[PDB]
Every structure is written in structure tokens, then in C-alpha cells.
Amino acid sequence: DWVIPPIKVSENERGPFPKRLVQIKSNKDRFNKVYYSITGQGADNPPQGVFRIEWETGWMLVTRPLDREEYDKYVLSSHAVSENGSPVEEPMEITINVIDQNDNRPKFTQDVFRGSVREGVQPGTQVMAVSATDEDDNIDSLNGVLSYSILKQDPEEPIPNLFTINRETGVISLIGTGLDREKFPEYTLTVQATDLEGAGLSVEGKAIIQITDANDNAPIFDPKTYTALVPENEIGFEVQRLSVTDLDMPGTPAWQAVYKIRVNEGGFFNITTDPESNQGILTTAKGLDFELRKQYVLQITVENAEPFSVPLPTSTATVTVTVEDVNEAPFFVPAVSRVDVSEDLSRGEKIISLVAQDPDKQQIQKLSYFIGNDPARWLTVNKDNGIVTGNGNLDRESEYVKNNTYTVIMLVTDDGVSVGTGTGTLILHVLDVNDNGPVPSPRVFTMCDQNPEPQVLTISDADIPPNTYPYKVSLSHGSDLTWKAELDSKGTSMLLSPTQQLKKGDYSIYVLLSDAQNNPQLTVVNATVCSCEGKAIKCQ
Amino acid sequence: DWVIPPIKVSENERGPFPKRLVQIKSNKDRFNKVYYSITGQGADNPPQGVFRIEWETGWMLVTRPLDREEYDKYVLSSHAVSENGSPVEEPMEITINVIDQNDNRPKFTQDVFRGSVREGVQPGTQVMAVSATDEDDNIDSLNGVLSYSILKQDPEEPIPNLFTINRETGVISLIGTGLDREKFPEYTLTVQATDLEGAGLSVEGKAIIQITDANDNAPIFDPKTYTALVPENEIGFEVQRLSVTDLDMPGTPAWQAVYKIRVNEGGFFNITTDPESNQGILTTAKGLDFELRKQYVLQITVENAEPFSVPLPTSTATVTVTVEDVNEAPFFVPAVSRVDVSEDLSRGEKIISLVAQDPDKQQIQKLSYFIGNDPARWLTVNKDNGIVTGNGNLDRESEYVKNNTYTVIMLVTDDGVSVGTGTGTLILHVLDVNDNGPVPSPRVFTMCDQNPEPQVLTISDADIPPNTYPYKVSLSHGSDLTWKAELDSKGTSMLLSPTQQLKKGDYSIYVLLSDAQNNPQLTVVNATVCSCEGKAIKCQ
Ligand SMILES: *[C@@H]1O[C@H](CO)[C@@H](O)[C@H](O)[C@H]1NC(C)=O
Ligand SMILES: *[C@@H]1O[C@H](CO)[C@@H](O)[C@H](O)[C@H]1NC(C)=O
Ligand SMILES: *[C@@H]1O[C@H](CO)[C@@H](O)[C@H](O)[C@H]1NC(C)=O
Ligand SMILES: *[C@@H]1O[C@H](CO)[C@@H](O)[C@H](O)[C@H]1NC(C)=O
Ligand SMILES: *[C@@H]1O[C@H](CO)[C@@H](O)[C@H](O)[C@H]1NC(C)=O
Ligand SMILES: *[C@@H]1O[C@H](CO)[C@@H](O)[C@H](O)[C@H]1NC(C)=O
Ligand SMILES: *[C@@H]1O[C@H](CO)[C@@H](O)[C@H](O)[C@H]1NC(C)=O
Ligand SMILES: *[C@@H]1O[C@H](CO)[C@@H](O)[C@H](O)[C@H]1NC(C)=O
Ligand SMILES: *[C@@H]1O[C@H](CO)[C@@H](O)[C@H](O)[C@H]1NC(C)=O
Numbered sequence A, B: 001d002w003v004i005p006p007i008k009v010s011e012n013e014r015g016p017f018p019k020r021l022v023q024i025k026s027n028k029d030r031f032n033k034v035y036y037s038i039t040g041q042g043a044d045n046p047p048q049g050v051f052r053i054e055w056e057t058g059w060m061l062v063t064r065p066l067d068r069e070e071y072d073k074y075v076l077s078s079h080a081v082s083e084n085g086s087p088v089e090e091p092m093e094i095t096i097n098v099i100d101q102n103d104n105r106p107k108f109t110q111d112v113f114r115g116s117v118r119e120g121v122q123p124g125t126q127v128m129a130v131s132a133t134d135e136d137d138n139i140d141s142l143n144g145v146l147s148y149s150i151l152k153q154d155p156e157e158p159i160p161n162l163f164t165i166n167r168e169t170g171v172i173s174l175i176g177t178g179l180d181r182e183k184f185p186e187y188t189l190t191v192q193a194t195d196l197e198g199a200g201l202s203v204e205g206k207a208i209i210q211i212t213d214a215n216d217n218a219p220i221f222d223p224k225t226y227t228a229l230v231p232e233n234e235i236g237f238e239v240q241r242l243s244v245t246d247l248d249m250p251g252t253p254a255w256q257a258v259y260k261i262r263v264n265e266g267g268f269f270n271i272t273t274d275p276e277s278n279q280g281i282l283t284t285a286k287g288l289d290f291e292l293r294k295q296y297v298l299q300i301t302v303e304n305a306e307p308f309s310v311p312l313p314t315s316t317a318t319v320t321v322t323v324e325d326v327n328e329a330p331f332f333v334p335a336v337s338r339v340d341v342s343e344d345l346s347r348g349e350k351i352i353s354l355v356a357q358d359p360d361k362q363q364i365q366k367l368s369y370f371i372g373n374d375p376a377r378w379l380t381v382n383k384d385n386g387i388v389t390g391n392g393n394l395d396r397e398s399e400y401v402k403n404n405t406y407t408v409i410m411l412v413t414d415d416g417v418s419v420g421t422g423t424g425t426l427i428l429h430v431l432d433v434n435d436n437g438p439v440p441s442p443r444v445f446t447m448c449d450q451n452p453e454p455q456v457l458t459i460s461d462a463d464i465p466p467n468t469y470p471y472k473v474s475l476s477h478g479s480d481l482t483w484k485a486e487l488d489s490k491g492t493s494m495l496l497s498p499t500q501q502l503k504k505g506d507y508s509i510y511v512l513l514s515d516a517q518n519n520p521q522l523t524v525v526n527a528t529v530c531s532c533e534g535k536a537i538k539c540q
């Protein structure tokens, strides 16, 4: 058909109501009276009564103002019946479009936006982002397009133009330079959005930016030069602690100190760090020792764990140390294999005039010499002059003496001012003299009767050679009660044989030898005889 | 509903016909085939067939070109029935608006406009007014708004820009200066009107302006100096006529002449004007007279009835007159009570030597003296010398003479060259002489007998005093036939009485008187007597 165009109507209209929109006519009215009515939402349906028609003229009206924001369009159905009561025309659809008007102010997405950036970054860096909206049209008008802006950053210091915002997108960026967490950490700037691309109505928001941290700062010592005293030897011990103040953020690696000495003399120092006021705690690496050095001039520089965000001054601490003195024990010089001395020494004679030395050249402390180790008592010391003399009777020949030795240990004490011990061994070579003289091996025989065979006997000397070289056998009172002497060819033994057919048991034979001579006297080597033929038998 | 918008269509469209306008669909076609038709003016109604629809597709078309000027809009009704034959949708109204196109040239209201203005008016004066129209739109386009103009005034002289026209209203006004009915009275200018405020199409008209008249001109004489001759006395008469030429419009007061003399000597001149060539007709106010003046130098200026529309030169006419001569009658000087003359004058004696005078000093014309009035013939005149002598017998005493007078009139005639009369009266004092003498009153008595009483008688003189002073009575032959004389005391009468006793009737008495003397003789005063006693009785 020839339909009927949609009807545009403005919003928030205002004048004298009613307002005729249009007029409709059924031509089938030649016959009876026609009754015009109309139906739909806004008609008889909810919102009832916005539009109504004059049953007799065919006029359509808007009865009151409208807000497209509420309902932006309506569709209606129109009718025409006869007085008799019958419909005449197939109904007719009707449309109305509600044209937008700038009745709406915009509104920010949130009531407050927050942001953050680091202090050392470069100009032209994107920080935050902000939103807002207008409910009016924005597809055929500007009643709903906004334009963003900024008008007041607080801390109007260092300067007041650190940022800008993209008018269309509302994004903010760092424009200037001079950000420092250490002086001004959080800005509060006021934003506004406007109707018709900055032309219409405006509103406010608030965005707040916190500033991350940077290693803008270096560490600073609170003393620059310290001093402490120290002892030579127990040690590995705490000398002095140090103080400092970095200014970036505390629990952070831009706040933790790292040290080191420049030069470690004997490399006898270690230094650690501590999460207190991360003071510098210095200590001794390997004890000290001395009388060698009293002075210690060393320097320690301090850094952070992480590198610096800028060239900065490295700052050292210069420190002086002094070693207190402890006084140590003295010592005999050697451990003496000294005196190759003979057995004939006169009880009270100079053996070893000895001396001991003591470390501490503070030496105005003497000591006393004491002896100590010990198989039995011979020797003697002058305690205030360390003089070892030889008292007593010695005898290389016999008991304690093991290999050609006699080892003895002695002491010495550090007095004068405190304490001390000195353990020193002393081996002294004893010597030989020909003391003893020759002696027979077996002392009792068992001779036989009829024809006894030679009674083997031998010789032994306690002395050391030559002193036991060859012999000379001799038979004293009974050199004839019949007894005849004899030597083995290979030196050592002697052959003892009677020369008479003598008696039934129990009787001695006086013996007498010599080796350089010395002559011993020996003696009786008794002789038990019991009935027989010729071989030395078990007796009775 | 969701109707269907009006359809705009251009006018004088042109391309390949048909032209689809729009397509309609009934959705109730799920069931049968639907048949699309359409109705109305331009459809099935007159203009039939401008639009038609394709029963099966639902397309609407314009079949041929259109002229909004003919029909600027159409309304149509669309239908849709089922094959079975039933309608499905309530019909649908359809509208088409025909948009204007500049197909129309404008046209002047009239084929020729006329106008008129007066020559002396000022620049910036509204004269005519002109109209014209275009039939195309003029409420949303310029297809129908005109712009007026002018492009050719004829008589491109004095200059060619006497006027302008208001482009929007088409009114014309005088812009320049130099209008003269007398040289260029009617302009013919060509006008044009145009489409789109002078932009589109144009056409022509014609406006013609006549120029009213003004008193631009003054009157001019055709002679500047005239002359005429004239006679002394019959008069009030036409001397000379005058000619002139004003140049404005003829039957008009800017063409009628008005005159006047500058100086009217004795105020004896009048001059009128005449609707001929309104010549100046001069005449004589009160006759002239003379021998007093021959010359007349006078001037007459000429104006118009209505003042002048500009300073102009007043132009006079200087004129000379000459008076011809007529010769008049002579006159005795006075009218004479002249001659106190006596009665004794000698017949033929000088009474009044008189003279008369005649006007015209051209005097070489004499006259003749004649007498004329008349009781009887005494006097006489010398006609060629006017001398009145006295012939005859006169007599103061008696007949014609009334009071002491005698009046006579005489004449004199102007000859020599033409004609003349002179009536002059003449009274002449006559005088007294003592002519007559005394005389008795009654001449006949009636006396009585016995004793007659005195017969009274009296006296009378024809003379004038002293000449009749007192008397002297005398009785002649019968101074005694008995008669005795007597005078009255108071002079006049006389007492007559007998002295004898005398006779019976019929007889006279001779009487005789005197007054200076003169002596009269009188006479007989007869006396009739009849019988009696004493009183004068009636007789017998
Ligand atoms: C930003 O927020 C802080 C915290 O309240 C406030 O003190 C400051 O004034 C605001 N503006 C700036 C530029 O710091
Ligand atoms: C020396 O060492 C001591 C240790 O107690 C310290 O207090 C002092 O500051 C250091 N410097 C000097 C000059 O004494
Ligand atoms: C670190 O020590 C320096 C030296 O006096 C001082 O100026 C600074 O304030 C200290 N740091 C802090 C956080 O106090
Ligand atoms: C202190 O500094 C030294 C030197 O680098 C380092 O070895 C040590 O680990 C540090 N102490 C601490 C607790 O970090
Ligand atoms: C530390 O060493 C320096 C370098 O010679 C010296 O001046 C200072 O006296 C020493 N000790 C102290 C107490 O500073
Ligand atoms: C000698 O030195 C040895 C070796 O240590 C030791 O066993 C002995 O007791 C010391 N004295 C003697 C008498 O041998
Ligand atoms: C010296 O050392 C000895 C070791 O035999 C010890 O018994 C003694 O106590 C020390 N003497 C002193 C005075 O400290
Ligand atoms: C020295 O005396 C000390 C103290 O008893 C002892 O420990 C040590 O064994 C002794 N010997 C030597 C050779 O120092
Ligand atoms: C040997 O025997 C004799 C005889 O009785 C006896 O006197 C002696 O003591 C024994 N031994 C020695 C070495 O004399």
C-alpha cells in the first residue's frame, strides 16, 4: 500500500498539551458513522494514555512529555468500526520514534581510580587508564561522546606538569621528569569528562598515583673512621661493628649492605652483614700473633645487593686496629741428645749447662728451671740458672738403660708476670767402663762315677767390647782336688774335668777368670756326683 | 501504524518510461495468491493511467512526465484481494508531491503601463509603478521571485538617466534633473523582470511617462514699443492693441496675460486683456481734452495669473500717444448784467461793446456775432465786431419789463474752419425818466340831487419816485360850473364837490394835475346825476 510514515517526536517536549500528531480517515464512511479508536503500549496498554484519538475526527495526539531514555519508540494499531458495530478497515500499524536530547550528564566508571609508576622511568611512559559514560545518543549526535582532561595534580611540586591524558581514550602518561619516591611519593590529580567532545557538560573524578622505588641512593656510613683493640690468641672474634644509612626502601635489596676490605694483609679478616641496621660486623679470620704488628689500616666499601640506577659515589670506611698483648710460655731450645758422658762421673759435675728462651719481648719476666721426668734420682738442676749437674752413682751396665740410652724430660716456668710451661726431652749418651768380670754359666753339675765326661761350662761379661775379649782360666785352692781347666776353641766355654777317681757327691771347685785381667774371682760351682759310667746323668 | 511516507517526484521528468516508485507486499499471502490493484485520480479516475501497479509483484510506477503547474499532488488508495475473491487488508492511502521546476517565464501585469509627472519637481520623487508575475514556486525556491530593471529611456536627451526603479517593488522614481515639458514632454522606457532575483529568465514591458506643465516661462511682447493717434472728445475709446507670447500651456493661467500701466497721469487709461492671443487692449478712461498735452510715454508690464515657478524677467512695453485736434465752440465771456442805461437813449448808440473767446489756439478761425432771444426789436449788433448798439424807442414804464428788468440772450458762431455756438444771456438795467403825469381813479360818478356828498377821486403816476411826489390840483374851463377841488391829508385822493345846486345828469368836469409839475391835463371825469338827498347812489 500507500502506508503511513513513522512519526518523529522530540524528547522532553514542552508547551501546551495536547499536540496533534496526525489525522486519519476511513473512506468507507459514506455509509454510516465511523468510530476511531487505537491500541497498544502507550495506548491502552502500559504506559496507558500517552496517546489518544478523537473517535469522531480521527486526530492523534501526544498527551504529555516523553524521555527516550525511558522508551525510545512506540508501535500502535488503529481502528475504525461502524455505528452498527462492524469493523470497516483492516487495522493499521503506527510508529513513533523518540529523538534524543542532551538531558544526560556523563559519569565516571569508578568513583576513584588508582595508579603506580617507578621513579626512574622515562618521559612518554603510559601509567593509568580512566573511564566514564553518557547515556544520551552517541551514534548520530555528540550528546554522548566525551573528551577527557586533567586540571589539578597535587604536590604541585617539583613542577606541576608531570602528566597528560589522551582526550579520546582517557589514558594517562608521564610527560615530564623529576620523579622521586624519596621526596614526593604519591600524586593526586583531578580529572574531568565532557559532553560533545569537551563542549557540553562536565564532571569530576580522582585518580591517585603512587611511585614505585628506585636505587636512587647509595649507602652512607655513620662513622667514617673507627678504632678497636684486640688480643693475639684464643681467637676468631668480633672486633667492631659499623653503622650506615641507605635511603631507598628498607626490606629491599636497595637497602641491604654488602662489604669487603680492600686489602687483606695475611688474609686474616672476615666481615659479614646483618639485617639489623645492616651494620658492618667485622671479625678476625685466623687469630693474630703479636709482637709482629700493632697497626692495621684497612678500608671497607659498601654496596647494595642490586646495581645502581645511576652513577653514584662509593663510600669507604677507614679503620684502625691495635693488638693487645698476651704473654706466652718459654721453651728450652732443643730437645737434647747431648751428653755422651761416661759412668765414672763425679757426683756433682757439670753435664749440660742449658738455656731456654721466652717469646714476649716485654721480657722483664724470668723463669725457674725444674726437672721432671724420671726413672731414678741422679741429676740436679740449679733452678735460677738452668744448670744440669750429675749427682749419684750411675752404671751404664744395667737396668733402665735400654738401648745405649737414658732419656729424661724436664721443665721450665714463665713467671715474672704470669704463667708458663716448657716440655723438653733430654737423651744423654751413657758410656762404657769395664766394671764386672767373667762368670760361669751353669753353677751345679751332676757328674757321674765310673767315667764322667767333660762338664761343659761357659763365660759371660756384663761389659761391652773390647772389655770382654779373651780369657785366662784359673783354679785357686783346689787346683788339685783334681780339677783341670779348659777353653773351647771358638772362645766362650771352658772344659772342666777331674784327674782323680773321686767321691760320692756334694763338693765345689773354686774358679778364677780374667778379661783385660780384672781377674775374677769366681768361685764355687759346686758338684753333685752320683753312681755311674760316663755320661752326665739326672741325679738323685 | 507504520505508515508509508509521501513520495516526492520531480516535474517534467524525462528518461525511459516506466519508473518504479515503490513496492508493496501483503503478508497475508501465505494462504492464496494476492492481487494488487490501486484506485484514485491519476489512477482509474481522471487523469486516468498516470500510475499503475503490477498485480503480481506490487510495484508502483509513474508512466509519463508531469507538470506540477497542472496538478501538484495526488492521493491514491491501494488494494489486495485473494484469488478466491476476498479482500485481505484494509486499503492503504498513498501520497505523491510534485516538486517545482523552473519551467515558467514571468509576465507583466499589463502590456503597457502609463505615467505622468510635472517638469519642475525635485530629484527623489516617486512617479509610476509596474507589475508582473511568475507561476513557478516562490515560497521555497526563487523560481518565482522577480527583480525589476530598466534598460532604455527614449529621448536619450538631455541626459539618459532621469529615472531608476526599485528592483524588489518595481516602483520608479525621478533621479536626475532637467525636465522640461516645453522641449521633451514624453519619455518611453523599456523595463525587464527576472527569475531568481534577476538570475533566471527575463521579459519586457513598456512604460510611458508624460510630463505635466510648469510656469517655466514668462510672457514676451511682440512689439516692444508702439504708437497710436487719438481725438480729444467723444470718448472712452480703443487706442491700440498689443501682442505677446508666453510658452507654457495655452488654455492655462500660465498663459493668460495680466497688465497694468506703471504711471497713470490723470488716471485716464484702462487696459483689459482678451482670450484671443490674449492681446493687450488699451483704451481711454475719461476722454482727453487737448491743447494741454500731445505726448504720452507710458509703460505696461505683463504677468500671468499664477506666480512663477522661477525668478524670471518681467517684460514691459513702452508706448507713445498723440492727441489729434477737434475744434470747439467760442463763448462770450460773461452772461451780462451790464448796462444800467436810461430810457432817453438815442436810437443807434453804444450800449455794450462786447467780446467772446474761442478755445483752440489754432486760432485762425473767426466767428460772427448774431443776436437771438427776444421780446421786441430794439437793439442791434455788428456781426463781425460784436458791438451792441441801441436802436429804437424804449420805455422803462411798461410792458415786458417785469422787475426792473429786460433780459435778452444772444449768439456767436465758430467759423473759419468748422462749426460753433455760444449761448449767452444778457440782462440790462433800464432806468427811470418821468414820462407820464397824474390821473384820476374813477372816471364816472353818480351824484345825488338834494345834497350830494363828496365824490372821492384819487391820483396815479406811471413813474417811479421822486417823480410822483405830491400834487397840485387844477380846474380848467369849468373852474366854476361849480366844482371845488381837494386833497386827502395822507396825499393820494382828491375831494370833488360842487358849489351850485345844479342839474339833472350827464356832464363833465375838466381836471388838471402836476407832480414835479409835468402838469397833466387831465380831463373830463364826467358826472351822471339822478334825483335825491345826499349819498352817492346807484343810478338810472
Ligand atoms: C595524593 O595523595 C596523597 C595521600 O592522601 C595526598 O597527601 C597528596 O596531597 C595527593 N596529591 C599529591 C600530588 O601527592
Ligand atoms: C676508636 O675505637 C673506639 C672503640 O671503642 C671507638 O669508640 C672510636 O670511635 C674509634 N675512633 C677513635 C678516634 O677513637
Ligand atoms: C644516614 O646518615 C646520614 C649522615 O648523618 C644522615 O644525613 C641521614 O639522615 C641518615 N639516614 C636517615 C634515614 O636518617
Ligand atoms: C656481608 O658482606 C659479605 C661480603 O660480600 C658477604 O659475603 C656476606 O654474605 C654479607 N652478609 C650478609 C648477611 O649478607
Ligand atoms: C687508624 O689509622 C689511621 C691511619 O694512620 C691513624 O690516623 C689512626 O690514629 C688509627 N687509629 C685511630 C684511633 O684512628
Ligand atoms: C727413655 O726414652 C724412652 C723413649 O720414650 C722412654 O720409653 C723411657 O722411659 C726413657 N727412659 C729410659 C731410662 O729409657
Ligand atoms: C706449666 O705446665 C705444667 C705442665 O707439666 C702444668 O702442670 C703447670 O700448671 C703449668 N704451670 C703454670 C705456672 O701455669
Ligand atoms: C709440656 O707441658 C705441657 C703442660 O702439661 C704438656 O701438655 C706437654 O705435653 C708438655 N710437653 C711438651 C713437649 O711440651
Ligand atoms: C756349694 O756347696 C757347698 C757345700 O755345702 C756350700 O757351702 C756352698 O754354699 C755351695 N755353693 C756355693 C756357691 O758355695
Ligand SMILES: *[C@@H]1O[C@H](CO)[C@@H](O)[C@H](O)[C@H]1NC(C)=O
Binding pocket: B153, B154, B155, B156, B186, B187, B188, B189, B208
Ligand atoms: C515616448 O513616447 C513618445 C510618443 O510616441 C515617443 O515619440 C518617444 O520617442 C518615446 N520616448 C521618449 C523618451 O520620449
Ligand SMILES: *[C@@H]1O[C@H](CO)[C@@H](O)[C@H](O)[C@H]1NC(C)=O
Binding pocket: B223, B225, B226, B227, B228, B229
Ligand atoms: C506707431 O503707431 C502705429 C499705429 O498704426 C504702429 O503701426 C507703429 O508700429 C507704432 N510705432 C511707430 C514707430 O510708428
Ligand SMILES: *[C@@H]1O[C@H](CO)[C@@H](O)[C@H](O)[C@H]1NC(C)=O
Binding pocket: B220, B221, B222, B244, B245, B246, B247
Ligand atoms: C513669441 O514671440 C517671440 C519673439 O519673436 C518668439 O521668439 C516666440 O517663438 C513666440 N512664441 C511662439 C510660440 O512662437
Ligand SMILES: *[C@@H]1O[C@H](CO)[C@@H](O)[C@H](O)[C@H]1NC(C)=O
Binding pocket: B257, B258, B259, B260, B271, B272, B273, B274, B275
Ligand atoms: C487684463 O488686465 C487687467 C489688469 O489687471 C485686469 O483687470 C483685467 O481683468 C484683464 N482682463 C482680462 C480679460 O482678464
Ligand SMILES: *[C@@H]1O[C@H](CO)[C@@H](O)[C@H](O)[C@H]1NC(C)=O
Binding pocket: B225, B226, B227, B296, B297, B319, B320, B321
Ligand atoms: C514714443 O515715446 C518715445 C519716448 O520719448 C519716443 O521716442 C517716440 O517717438 C514716441 N512715439 C513713437 C512713434 O515711438
Ligand SMILES: *[C@@H]1O[C@H](CO)[C@@H](O)[C@H](O)[C@H]1NC(C)=O
Binding pocket: B375, B400, B401, B402, B405, B406, B407, B408
Ligand atoms: C428776462 O429774463 C427772464 C428770466 O429768465 C425771462 O423770463 C424773460 O422772458 C426775459 N425778458 C424779459 C423782457 O423779461
Ligand SMILES: *[C@@H]1O[C@H](CO)[C@@H](O)[C@H](O)[C@H]1NC(C)=O
Binding pocket: B413, B419, B420, B421, B422
Ligand atoms: C450753433 O448753435 C445753435 C444753437 O442755437 C444751433 O442751432 C446751430 O446749429 C449751431 N451752428 C452751427 C454752425 O453749428
Ligand SMILES: *[C@@H]1O[C@H](CO)[C@@H](O)[C@H](O)[C@H]1NC(C)=O
Binding pocket: B421, B422, B423, B424
Ligand atoms: C447755446 O446754444 C446751444 C445750441 O442750441 C443750446 O443747446 C444751449 O441751450 C444754448 N445756451 C447756452 C447757455 O449755451
Ligand SMILES: *[C@@H]1O[C@H](CO)[C@@H](O)[C@H](O)[C@H]1NC(C)=O
Binding pocket: B506, B507, B508, B523, B524, B525, B526
Ligand atoms: C363825457 O361826457 C361827455 C358828454 O356827452 C362826452 O362828450 C365825453 O366824451 C365823455 N367822456 C369824456 C372823457 O369826455
Ligand SMILES: *[C@H]1O[C@H](CO)[C@@H](O)[C@H](O)[C@H]1NC(C)=O
Binding pocket: A270, A271, A272
Ligand atoms: C667468614 O665467616 C663467615 C661466618 O662463618 C663464613 O660464612 C665466611 O665464609 C667466612 N669468610 C668470608 C670471606 O666471609
Ligand SMILES: *[C@H]1O[C@H](CO)[C@@H](O)[C@H](O)[C@H]1NC(C)=O
Binding pocket: A301, A303, A311, A312, A313, A314
Ligand atoms: C664506586 O665503586 C663501586 C663499586 O665498589 C661502583 O659500583 C660505583 O659506581 C663507584 N662510583 C662511581 C662514581 O662510579
Ligand SMILES: *[C@H]1O[C@H](CO)[C@@H](O)[C@H](O)[C@H]1NC(C)=O
Binding pocket: A224, A225, A299, A314, A315, A316, A317, A318
Ligand atoms: C677514610 O678515612 C681515611 C683517612 O681520612 C681515608 O684515607 C679514606 O680514603 C677514607 N674513606 C673515605 C670513603 O673517605
Ligand SMILES: *[C@H]1O[C@H](CO)[C@@H](O)[C@H](O)[C@H]1NC(C)=O
Binding pocket: A301, A314, A315, A316, A317
Ligand atoms: C672509598 O672512599 C675512599 C675515600 O673517599 C676512596 O678513596 C676509595 O676509592 C673508595 N673506594 C671505592 C672502592 O670506591
Ligand SMILES: *[C@H]1O[C@H](CO)[C@@H](O)[C@H](O)[C@H]1NC(C)=O
Binding pocket: A334, A335, A336, A409, A423, A424, A425, A426
Ligand atoms: C720431649 O721432647 C722431645 C723432643 O726432643 C720429643 O721428641 C718427645 O716426644 C718429648 N717427650 C715428651 C714426653 O714430651
Ligand SMILES: *[C@H]1O[C@H](CO)[C@@H](O)[C@H](O)[C@H]1NC(C)=O
Binding pocket: A402, A403, A404, A405
Ligand atoms: C739406639 O740406637 C739405635 C741406632 O741408632 C736407634 O735406632 C735406637 O732407637 C736406639 N735405641 C733402641 C732401643 O734401639
Ligand SMILES: *[C@H]1O[C@H](CO)[C@@H](O)[C@H](O)[C@H]1NC(C)=O
Binding pocket: B270, B271, B272
Ligand atoms: C476699465 O473698463 C473695464 C470695462 O468696462 C472695467 O470693467 C474696468 O473696471 C475699468 N477700469 C479698470 C482699471 O480696468
